[PDB]
Design a protein around this ligand. Structure first.
Ligand SMILES: Cc1c[nH]c(=O)nc1N
Ligand SMILES: Cc1c[nH]c(=O)nc1N
Ligand SMILES: [Fe+2]
Ligand SMILES: [Fe+2]
Lengths: 411, 411
């Protein structure tokens, strides 16, 4: 399959892309806009990019908003209470159906890489079972990673350590955690030591719900980053929801950044979720409660954006569109500068792929898998400004989605 | 013309709407979904609403971002400096071209009512001249209101009072202001006394850039509300950008609400703009900087959302889509409760029409103008969750915009 007249990110030239046997066989710069060629796909000057990534979503809880009742306070903690109620009626078939629907939404919006957290503080491990199967069933659409996420705590929930271990043995690819939610500070610390030992013993990645709270003294991030640094596993470690960093003492935070850089760990921010769940315990002025995304990125630390929730006990909205999240993130994090906008797609493509350790299985380079999108925009700035539609999604060299270009009629 | 199978807001039944001679002739509930009729428009269960309203935009400055240089700090004050530079090359024809392009964007997204601020601290009054003409030229698409907006101050800019007066005499429908930007507190107060006297002398509406600053002592809102209350002109007065209220002392703000309610004035919030321009003088934690929208609404005070800028010296993004702004507002203002979501379109339709004093020239009621939209969603919640496309826009009984329903193919 051939694509002509395609823009690539942050370049002025038009390119032809040759796809063959499921891989990118050739990328060639063109002298100028070319007339059509033997039923090649004409990008018509539109941007070709690698697929969008959703590096952090909770597929087990998706589409369960209001069951059996609503999160009235809009807080993390009531969300957990409501989820606990919902868990009493989780079945594998229920989970499968909701997960597949939400995966469909993500596919519709160009996402081909997904990392889902699954609550393993559930003695049935029903959702985990369903999602491990879904990983195989939906492989034609996405590459799914699964995180063993101990929602109610490792040290603070009955048999939490056994459940984490069992989840990993069952085949979860990533070790999760929630140290800020453990019952005492010391148990928060021991939970991080445990989960890092677990990941090392079974050779898994790590992605931890780190400090998802507005408390300036929630500092489990330092424990996680130090373990990653000492163990030499930074590239394999992600800190999600470091919301407390947005409230840290500034002298401490400056000192902390030295460790963060040295550790090599990744960061995920969920700006629509955090703007909703954070700042709930302030009056006025009301803090944003989002981590220091612009500052991490300027420091050379890999950070990216994620949806987190779609219609679940924590967040009543969501539609699968990562460009909406990008927009939110750029506004809330004060990243609407000219230079920011020219490369903003980094935060929902390249940087996210790095967090998921996709390596050579991601990116528009010869020899890599033929997974790519054609976006209805010519550069990063226009993509976010217009919320550009995904016109074509190609996966393993085949078109799996085709949208018509929007046409408006006037009198 | 006839529309069948239409939902109306916050109602379960389907409705047929009969439009004749530019007005709504009849609205009738149906027993159920009906098969198509004699060239009737089939809403197919989609929502019919009165048009979106853009109650606060700066059309004189639209599409000038980066000219002659960029707002690097992303602040209100640097924006004013950049605009001051751009004013040196403003012409009526330049203004007309940019304004008409942005009006086209608003039309594409179902806006039929627009209130634009125009900077009248410009001895040429060039943009105002162009926009008064545009008001007539674009009448086929929108009903435009023009605010005489003294960007560089009434008391603090050469001949500011003369310029305000001349702008009103030229035909600006609304008197503007910027008391928080006046050089001293006493001049901020005198500016409000002057602009209210001006509005009364000429019988005009009022819409003031009130306290667009994170300073908890910026309290010109109380002066404006008191003048409106005393003069009995509450309904004709709007306070835009009361960002400082998001930082007020809470005891003061409680006392203040008593006056705000009694005064009857309207409020406009610009959440995407304020999240960008506000919080810039904090470090961490970083305030949201948006007025107390949910609290105003709960108190029975009319409040609504607006875009403010499209690609201008203050804000680099913008596409005309008020639903994007609604989404932002609901998130930043903590209004994602179930009750909130079921009526959220209030903030971009009914409430905004009230701010603009549209009266019986707005709304789906028999006898009123046949101005309405068909949205690709069945209720308020779905409209914001899906960012529903405007499928049809009808103005004065005629279709002025038609979109085809998005169709995705899966090969
Ligand atoms: C969605 C979600 C679930 N659970 C949690 O601890 N945090 C979240 N953001
Ligand atoms: C856009 C804009 C222009 N001028 C101003 O004073 N405030 C604004 N938000
Ligand atoms: Fe999460
Ligand atoms: Fe404004």
């Amino acid at each position: 399959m051939k694509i002509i007249n395609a823009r690539l990110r942050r370049q002025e030239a038009l390119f032809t892309l040759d796809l063959q046997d499921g891989i990118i066989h050739r990328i060639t710069a063109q002298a100028a806009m070319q007339t059509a060629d033997a039923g090649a796909i004409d990008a018509q000057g539109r941007l070709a990019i690698p697929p969008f990534v959703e590096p952090h979503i909770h597929l087990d809880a998706t589409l369960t908003a209001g069951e059996p009742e609503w999160n009235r306070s809009g807080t993390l903690f009531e969300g957990i209470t409501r989820w606990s109620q919902r868990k009493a009626s989780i079945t594998p078939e229920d989970t499968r159906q909701r997960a597949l629907k939400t995966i469909g939404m993500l596919r519709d919006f160009g996402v081909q890489h997904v990392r889902t957290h699954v609550d393993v503080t559930d003695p049935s491990l029903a959702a985990l079972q369903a999602l491990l199967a879904v990983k195989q069933e939906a492989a034609d659409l996405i590459d799914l990673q699964i995180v063993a996420f101990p929602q109610e705590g490792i040290e603070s929930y009955p048999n939490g350590r056994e459940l984490m271990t069992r989840a990993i043995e069952m085949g979860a690819d990533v070790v999760g955690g929630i140290p800020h939610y453990e019952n005492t500070r010391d148990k928060g610390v021991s939970s991080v030591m445990f989960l890092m030992d677990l990941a090392q013993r079974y050779g898994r990645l790590v992605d931890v719900h780190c400090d998802e709270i507005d408390d300036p003294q929630s500092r489990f991030l330092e424990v996680l980053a130090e373990e990653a640094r000492v163990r030499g596993m930074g590239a394999q470690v992600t800190a999600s929801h470091t919301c407390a960093m947005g409230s840290y003492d500034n002298a401490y935070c400056s000192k902390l950044f030295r460790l963060l850089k040295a550790s090599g760990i990744n960061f995920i921010s969920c700006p629509t979720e955090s703007i909703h769940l954070q700042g709930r315990f302030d009056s006025w002025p009301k803090r944003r409660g989002v981590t220091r995304v612009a500052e991490l990125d300027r420091a050379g630390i890999n950070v990216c954006f994620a949806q987190d929730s779609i219609q679940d006990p924590w967040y009543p909205l969501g539609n699968g569109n990562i460009l909406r999240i990008l927009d939110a993130g750029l506004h809330i994090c004060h990243m609407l500068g000219y230079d920011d906008l020219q490369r903003c797609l980094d935060f929902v493509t390249d940087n996210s792929a790095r967090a998921l350790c996709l390596g050579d299985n991601y990116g528009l380079a010869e020899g890599r898998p033929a997974n790519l999108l054609i976006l209805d925009a010519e550069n990063d700035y226009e993509a976010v400004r217009r919320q550009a539609r995904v016109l074509t999604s190609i996966r393993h060299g085949k078109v799996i989605l085709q949208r018509e270009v929007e046409h408006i009629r006037y009198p």
